[PDB]
Amino acid sequence: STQVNQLLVNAQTLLAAVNERGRSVSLLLERVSSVSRQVEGFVDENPNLNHV
Amino acid sequence: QVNSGDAIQRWAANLNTLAAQSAQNDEALRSGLQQAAPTADQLNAVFSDVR
């Protein structure tokens, strides 16, 4: 039971600290997908980069 | 627990959505881990070359 109590309170503290930066956290997935698409497009559209 | 019932319903629905999305992309997750193991090593090698 003591472990359960400490687990719950520390989970609350950790989640509060994490979602304090909610504006960036909410956009994390969208930004990572966008940068993935941009890197893929940049590599795809410049196939002569290696020759240069 | 009763005072946060709307919150627990919301995170239950969100967990359901996230879990369904992750399960429908199981093979993509596996391939992502497999290709993510050595690409960071490649990047570290490149950077340590130009450090």
Binding site: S1, L8, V9, Q12, A16, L29 | I8, R10, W11, N14
Partner: protein, 50 residues
């Protein structure tokens, strides 16, 4: 008679739930904060369908 045959089990349940509740009762606001933080955190990754 049925209750008396399970009397030891029932009072073991009572003595265990007593410790559980006595250790988890003081943090009621912490639990409300935890549930709200959890909902906020899991909302951060579900703003769209995919």
């Amino acid at each position: 008679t049925a209750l008396n045959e399970g009397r030891g089990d029932f009072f073991a349940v009572v003595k265990s739930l007593a410790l559980f509740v006595n250790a988890l009762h003081r943090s009621d606001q912490q639990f409300v904060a935890l549930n709200n933080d959890l909902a906020q955190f899991t909302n951060s990754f579900t703003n769209t369908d995919q």
